[PDB]
């Protein structure tokens, strides 16, 4: 057994973290108390769920997680919330004033003053690990903390834990819920600085999950609560293999091995189905063939793009519920004849499949309905570069006039870093086009 430490940064990272750990506790049968009746080995364990939970002599199960934010309001809700007994204070780290949606302020100014504290609190979790395998970092592109402080942290983690893997769960900015005009700046900036330090990053466009909530959950105006509950299901599907008995994606190293042939091209597109409203009285449960086919509809992707006009480098199908291999292969066979699925010449056209017999757990009183089977497809497709292109365009528009640039320079950053980061994104778009066209 090898431990995994989760790091939640900024408002998005923390609030998403809350949804995930709430969901992890339901899936593993852990109470807000922190007690886990099913766990008969008291005080310690070598089990799969111990990857995410440590144990105390009293039998409390404690998330190997650290919450960080340069402003205490959000984390204060965790300290006073339902799962307050779950974490111990040293895990929850808070500053006084935030990064004001400024990458430079989060990276250079305020980051410099708290980076040594966070690393020391992380170091204390690492010292309780017999074989720490790496980190799962949750954050936003748009926030000053989520973007600026994360990139600083990722730089230092590569220094202090050079051998360990690092996975990202990034929230990509969407105008319908964005709180800043400069979120395109922060995104390119944090992507540029973090790129070489991240092994596999799962982007989640707020736009996509926003529309999924409107379309399928029949929610008129989704809140962060609605968004995070759905995101947590995706994260849970992705991290389930680390927390349950299986033979596919059982360590962080295998994520890179299975999904990332080229290091810079480490942004797998996630697709999830079925998303059913808990308010629908009558619902016909969907078959393996129906949910698998849904994984190739852009309307169900975490990022709205068109894989038909790109190429695949890898594909993983993660099922949860009543599923057997025979029905998967039968569904894949049918789909391959009907859909446009082209891999790169230097990759096998195939699918790595994982089935967990336990159906998806849903938060009591949530928006999602209980389903007998669901699937999350992880596909490294070049079509996700459409997200970078949208982002880089917004960047170019503002930066041509140097709009808002003075806020960054004022915090000590140099204007050269803007172009340096944009150049790196230009090269990245170029890499995608070479591989996929």
């Amino acid at each position: 057994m090898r431990e995994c430490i989760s790091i939640h940064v900024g408002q998005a990272g923390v609030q998403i973290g809350n949804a995930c750990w709430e969901l992890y506790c339901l899936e593993h049968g852990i109470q807000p108390d922190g007690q886990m009746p099913s766990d008969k080995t008291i005080g310690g364990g070598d089990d799969s769920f111990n990857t995410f939970f440590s144990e105390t002599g009293a039998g409390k199960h404690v998330p190997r997680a650290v919450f960080v934010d340069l402003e205490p309001t959000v984390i204060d809700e965790v300290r006073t919330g339902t799962y307050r007994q779950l974490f111990h204070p040293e895990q929850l780290i808070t500053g006084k004033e935030d990064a004001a949606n400024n990458y430079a302020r989060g990276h250079y100014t305020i980051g410099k003053e708290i980076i040594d504290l966070v690393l020391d609190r992380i170091r204390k979790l690492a010292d309780q690990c017999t074989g720490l395998q790496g980190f799962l970092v949750f954050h936003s592109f748009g926030g000053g903390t989520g973007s600026g402080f994360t990139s600083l942290l990722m730089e230092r983690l590569s220094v202090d834990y050079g051998k360990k893997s690092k996975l990202e769960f990034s929230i990509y900015p969407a105008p319908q819920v964005s709180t800043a005009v400069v979120e395109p700046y922060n995104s390119i900036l944090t992507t540029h600085t973090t790129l070489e330090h991240s092994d596999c990053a799962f982007m989640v466009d707020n736009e996509a999950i926003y529309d999924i909530c409107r379309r399928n959950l029949d929610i008129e105006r989704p809140t962060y609560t609605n968004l995070n509950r759905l995101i947590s299901q995706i994260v849970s599907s992705i991290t389930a293999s680390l927390r349950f008995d299986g033979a596919l994606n059982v360590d962080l190293t295998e994520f890179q091995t299975n999904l990332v042939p080229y290091p810079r091209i480490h942004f797998p597109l996630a697709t999830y189905a079925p998303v059913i409203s808990a308010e629908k009285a009558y619902h016909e449960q969907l078959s393996v063939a129906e949910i698998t086919n849904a994984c190739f509809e852009p309307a169900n992707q975490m990022v709205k793009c068109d894989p038909r006009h790109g190429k695949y480098m890898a594909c993983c199908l993660l099922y949860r519920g009543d599923v057997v291999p025979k029905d998967v292969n039968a569904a894949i066979a049918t789909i391959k004849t009907k859909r446009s699925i082209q891999f790169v010449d230097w990759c096998p056209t195939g699918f790595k499949v994982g089935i967990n017999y336990q159906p998806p757990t849903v938060v009591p009183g949530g928006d999602l309905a209980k389903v007998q089977r669901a699937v999350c497809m992880l596909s490294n497709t070049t079509a996700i570069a459409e997200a970078w292109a949208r982002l880089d365009h917004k960047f170019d528009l503002m930066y041509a006039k140097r709009a808002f640039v003075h806020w960054y320079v004022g915090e000590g950053m140099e204007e050269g870093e803007f172009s340096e980061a944009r150049e790196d994104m230009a090269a990245l778009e170029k890499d995608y086009e070479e591989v996929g066209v």
Binding site: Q176, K401, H406, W407
Partner: protein, 430 residues
């Protein structure tokens, strides 16, 4: 617990300043004695932003009242919410400034400014995490204009890393007190361009025209003018005073509203426009709020927004309403008039919604715009300024206090530069 320190200087500053505290104290359920008697936890969740807590759970405005004559401040102390203010925070002289910027900035105000900074310092030391300062004043007088910009320059010296916000009232010959107001305003703008992060341009020309044309008040008083300002000030500080995602603090607001440091002069708006005691009974539909908030007739600065382009916009809706409908209607404004929003700042309109409405209304909307049309305001003051200055009229009032003509020349130049900088981005294309 991000505290804001409020300062009000001069007659105008303390009049509007007093009304501001009357309005928000009512919204937060604070009575004239400083005791809370509200019915919602939303009222106290961010009360510490503008109020200090004392024993007996008394709430005291973090406000500092400044003037060079005791007149208006004696009226405030005898006003309805006079007792609420900290008695030691009343700081005043006796001489007055005689509507002379030079008196407020260089002579009379210099004698008093240290006493004010001693009160500011005591307030700031008590802050858990000071955001910065908001100043209410007019630019046409002497104290609020002259000493106000002096205070600003001194506060920046001691607190260079804090945000400096101002509610600055602009002078209009329609409400003129003296002929030297264009001199005082131009000299003040010269200071504001340099030493403020955010300035709400409240124009007396606009306030008067609203009272006359729209509210059908044949003979507008200052009370009628301040009903509109206090409503605007309550609106644009909503995001700061209640739980919210957008523009929740002074710095995040600046980052979203100010693409270039000098261009930080905002054009505030409000809907529905009401007169005191009108007490209208029909709430506006979300579509009605949206069309009116963006209407020229609802702008507190006498500038035609269609004569320029919006760099950034911040809309705040107050009351119980469909957030879905707000989003649809806000998207509708941008898509129907996309030519008036610059294309080189994508998604430059941010919207907030607060469940608590202002008193007397079920539904209200406040508008904050950084438009290039604001140059019309500075052009106006510049014309009036140059008309006198070409003949050096009335300058003796200023040279008698030690000022030189060059300082007027520099101030005029910098304001004309500001006008030309707005015009530059009004013509810029992507």
């Amino acid at each position: 617990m991000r505290e804001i320190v409020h300062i009000q200087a001069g007659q105008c500053g303390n009049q509007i300043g007093a009304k501001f505290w009357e309005v928000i104290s009512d919204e937060h359920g604070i009575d004239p004695t400083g005791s809370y008697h509200g019915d919602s936890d939303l009222q106290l969740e961010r009360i510490n932003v503008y109020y200090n807590e004392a024993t007996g759970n008394k709430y005291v405005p973090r406000a500092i009242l400044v003037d060079l004559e005791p007149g208006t401040m004696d009226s405030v102390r005898s006003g309805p919410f006079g007792q609420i203010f900290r008695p030691d925070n009343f700081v005043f002289g006796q001489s007055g400034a005689g509507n002379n910027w030079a008196k407020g900035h260089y002579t009379e105000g210099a004698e008093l400014v240290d006493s004010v900074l001693d009160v500011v310092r005591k307030e700031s030391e008590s802050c858990d995490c000071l955001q910065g300062f908001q100043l209410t004043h007019s630019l046409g007088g002497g104290t609020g204009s002259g000493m106000g910009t002096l205070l600003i320059s001194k506060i920046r010296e001691e607190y260079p890393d804090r945000i400096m916000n101002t509610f600055s009232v602009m002078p209009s010959p329609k409400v003129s007190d003296t002929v030297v107001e264009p001199y005082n305003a131009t000299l003040s703008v010269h200071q504001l361009v340099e030493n403020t992060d955010e300035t709400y341009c409240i124009d007396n020309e606009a306030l008067y025209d609203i009272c006359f044309r729209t509210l059908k008040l044949t003979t507008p008083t200052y009370g009628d003018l301040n009903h509109l300002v206090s409503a605007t000030m309550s609106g644009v500080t909503t995001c700061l005073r209640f739980p919210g995602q957008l523009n929740a603090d002074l710095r995040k607001l600046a980052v979203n509203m100010v693409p270039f440091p000098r261009l930080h002069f905002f054009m505030p708006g409000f809907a529905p426009l009401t007169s005191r005691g009108s007490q209208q009974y029909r709430a506006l539909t979300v579509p009605e709020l949206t069309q009116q908030m963006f209407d020229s007739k609802n702008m507190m600065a006498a500038c035609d927004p269609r004569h320029g382009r919006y760099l950034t916009v911040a809309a705040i809706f107050r009351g119980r309403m469909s957030m879905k409908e707000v989003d649809e209607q806000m998207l509708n404004v941008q898509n129907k008039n996309s030519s008036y929003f610059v294309e080189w700042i994508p998604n430059n309109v941010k919207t907030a919604v607060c469940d608590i409405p202002p008193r007397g209304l079920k539904m209200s909307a406040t508008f904050i715009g950084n438009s290039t049309a604001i140059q019309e305001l500075f052009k106006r003051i510049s014309e009036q300024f140059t008309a006198m200055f070409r003949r050096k009229a009335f300058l003796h009032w200023y040279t008698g206090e030690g000022m030189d003509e060059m300082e007027f020349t520099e101030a005029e130049s910098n304001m004309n530069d500001l006008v030309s900088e707005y015009q530059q981005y009004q013509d810029a294309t992507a």
